[PDB]
């Protein structure tokens, strides 16, 4: 089919950008969890901001993320869904996950099982 | 504060070796500039464009601030900077500014021709433009080109020590300097003493009188040594140590540590500056509410 070339020289600028993205995601998640465990929604427009800036960096470097991150974050307001509104299933569709802002992220789960994403398949992925 | 940024080094080519008599003479003229009074000295070194630049890292600079001038500093109480004036006449194959610039502190130029003067102001990242005051001006200095170069950065530099060399050179010196002051619109004028000996040194009030008799005003002369002199030092000092005037490895203390003033407290090995734990995030609030410092 073609040529099989596997390079492990990772580039320094891509490592800098992904460390920046991962640091923003970690600080937003830790703000959200440290606020959520203790008391009510104090600075929930704050951490979301980081995620939004994170996604804007994903516009600049043109990089892609795993569907775990994009499944965690929202699409319109770009907030973390670690505490969502409601989860409904088999309500004449497949699945529905409601949020506080009203934007839902649903999944076709009632069609068939054993469907995996392209990054979750057996051999398509090499860690580190 | 006073800056004298054109003291020459007694060497022109890398094949030549400086004798100890010239080094002792430079020690005596630095003691001379410390005797009456000055604040900053940036010693200059000359290379040509058609020479063979060495492919080294720690051998590009025969300046040695650490071993000999570090011993002179403790009895002196001043500082030295190392700088290069680029003698460029034709666009030849020689281009190694990424090493010669980052090795030294201030990058200057000495153009002789027409196109070189244009490509120096246009593309070459330097700090100062020095002209050959000993010889003739190349063709003409235009107003809008030099004005846009000053608005871009780089200022013009007048060497009042070159008139103290010979008798015939004074006429060409004044004929160059009046044209420089006229075409520069009195914005980018930095003055320096090109003396190879302590026997040609002057005081501030005599250099001010020289600048008066050349055609530039007096308040603008002292402003050129206070404002314009120490800013073009900081330009090259931030360009070569730090990023392109973006993020600096220099400690911002109250009145003792500065990128210009605290040279010895910065490790000049690569970049770094070893600073003790003066910032504690635990129990330090507003500055006026502290009690331990």
């Amino acid at each position: 089919n073609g040529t099989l070339l596997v390079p492990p020289p990772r580039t320094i600028a891509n490592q800098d950008h992904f460390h920046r993205l991962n640091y923003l995601y970690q600080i937003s998640a830790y703000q959200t969890r440290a606020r959520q465990k203790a008391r009510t929604d104090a600075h929930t427009p704050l951490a979301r901001n980081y995620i939004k800036s994170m996604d804007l960096i994903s516009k600049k470097t043109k990089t892609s993320l795993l569907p775990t991150i994009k499944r965690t974050i929202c699409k319109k307001c770009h907030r973390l869904l670690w505490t969502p509104k409601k989860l409904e299933i088999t309500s004449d569709g497949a699945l529905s996950v409601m949020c506080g802002c009203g934007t839902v992220k649903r999944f076709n789960i009632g069609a068939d099982p054993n469907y995996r994403t392209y990054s979750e398949r057996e051999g398509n992925l090499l860690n580190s | 504060m006073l800056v004298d940024l054109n003291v020459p080094w007694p060497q022109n080519s890398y094949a030549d070796k400086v004798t100890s008599q010239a080094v002792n003479n430079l020690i005596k003229t630095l003691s001379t500039l410390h005797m009456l009074g000055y604040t900053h000295i940036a010693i200059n070194f000359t290379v040509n464009h058609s020479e063979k630049f060495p492919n080294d890292v720690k051998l590009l600079n025969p300046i040695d601030i650490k071993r000999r001038f570090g011993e002179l500093m403790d009895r002196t109480g001043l500082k030295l900077y190392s700088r290069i004036t680029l003698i460029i006449d034709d666009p030849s194959k020689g281009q190694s500014l990424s090493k010669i610039s980052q090795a030294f502190d201030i990058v200057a130029a000495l153009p002789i021709s027409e196109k070189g003067l244009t490509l120096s102001t246009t593309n070459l990242d330097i700090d100062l433009l020095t002209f050959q005051y000993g010889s003739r001006l190349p063709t003409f200095l235009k107003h809008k080109s030099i004005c846009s170069c000053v608005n871009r950065g780089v200022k013009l530099e007048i060497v009042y020590g070159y008139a103290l060399r010979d008798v015939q050179a004074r006429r060409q010196f004044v004929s160059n300097v009046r044209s420089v002051i006229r075409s520069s619109r009195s914005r980018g004028i930095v003055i320096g003493s090109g003396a190879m000996s302590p026997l040609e040194c002057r005081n501030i009030l005599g250099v001010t009188s020289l600048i008066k008799n050349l055609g530039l005003p007096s308040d603008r002369c002292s402003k050129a040594m206070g404002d314009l002199a120490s800013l073009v030092l900081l330009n090259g000092r931030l360009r070569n140590k730090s990023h392109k005037q973006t993020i600096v490895t220099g400690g911002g203390s109250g009145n003792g540590d500065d990128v210009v003033n605290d040279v010895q407290g910065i490790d000049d090995v690569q970049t770094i500056k070893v600073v003790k734990r003066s910032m504690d995030a635990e129990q330090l609030g507003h500055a006026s509410k502290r009690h331990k410092p």
């Binding site: 901001n49 802002c101 | 990023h243 911002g252 507003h286």
Partner: protein, 227 residues
Amino acid sequence: MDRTQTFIKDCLFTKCLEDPEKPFDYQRINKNSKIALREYINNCKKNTKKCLKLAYENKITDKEDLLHYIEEKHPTIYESLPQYVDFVPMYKELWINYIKELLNITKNLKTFNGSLALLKLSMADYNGALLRVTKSKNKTLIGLQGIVIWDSQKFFIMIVKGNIIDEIKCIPKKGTVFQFEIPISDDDDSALRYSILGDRFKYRSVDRAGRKFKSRRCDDMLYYIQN
């Protein structure tokens, strides 16, 4: 009969007549994250002013007694107050460990490379940093340390504590010098201290991820030589 006609050339013509004359609830907040962030940083300042008023009404200078006083007598006012004691470990440890991982700062310090480290700091984000105003055009801005909650274009947002003050502090960047310490894991032997200037970069962090910074005229930096 003079050429300088004041009333004629401006007030009475048809071209300069336009010139002044010579005789003369939860969903609506988080629709935009920026506007909700603005409402939050306004609400924190208003709650800090109300906290100062209730602190003068309390007449107790201790802040640990003041927080319990607000918890006892003002429940709804206490809900929007910041917690700096919580803010320090949740930010400083992550920031220091991220810089120790990113800039390759390890136990071996003799293999360091400064230019690539400054390039990484030009590529790294400052969201969550402890930063100190060391020099400024204003004499009152200096001496302020604080941790970033958000990066703006030309201003800077930190938080600092006083005796009883817990106000969100906005500081201009045009004409200020900032510094931050990078500690090393050894105790009291060696540590690093870097500096930035907020007047030099005047863009968003989104643009800062892509922009390659170039030289400037740098004429307005005389204050850094002055003070």
